[PDB]
Write a protein that binds this ligand. Structure first.
Ligand SMILES: [Ca+2]
Ligand SMILES: [Ca+2]
Lengths: 97, 97
């Protein structure tokens, strides 16, 4: 549903600090800063309580850079593209090299 | 949720033909024209399939004006105010004389 900021939804509040940014704060310790001018950029912030618990393109948040390229299969890839291609959501998406 | 027109929701479509009117059409044979400029006025149109079945401030749609002041109790009131006050939704609302 195309809504209108600001919103106080279930556990999440989204608002516009200015005409350039959109900020979405959750009660789980996750904040999103979204720059829309000139191009979209994302700054995600995670609370310290989620250290070693998350996983995805942003790593597992355990202060170790080496294992940030570890896929869901349990091995650490050697290149950024190989680890990147394992987090697609659709089959038709190309394999980036 | 504060939405933006047009909306195609379940069994209803709401749009803005102009800056003065909002039109909401349902699949049950009901249509609402809402004039917003200069003051809010309503025109409801009902399909013939609902003749003799509805009931409210707009009558029972049975081509008889005599029973249009019939309340849910079962009798026809004599004044517009007495029948009008029986279709309140809250107890604290005043009784119009
Ligand atoms: Ca890590
Ligand atoms: Ca009638």
């Amino acid at each position: 549903i195309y809504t209108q900021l600001p919103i106080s939804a279930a556990n999440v509040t989204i608002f516009r600090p200015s005409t350039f940014f959109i900020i979405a704060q959750t009660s789980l310790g996750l904040q999103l800063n979204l720059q829309l001018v000139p191009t979209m950029q994302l700054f995600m912030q995670l609370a310290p309580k989620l250290r070693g618990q998350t996983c995805g393109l942003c790593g597992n948040f355990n202060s170790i850079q080496a294992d940030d390229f570890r896929t869901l299969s349990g091995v650490v890839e050697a290149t950024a593209a190989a680890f990147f291609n394992t987090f697609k959501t659709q089959a038709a998406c190309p394999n980036i090299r």
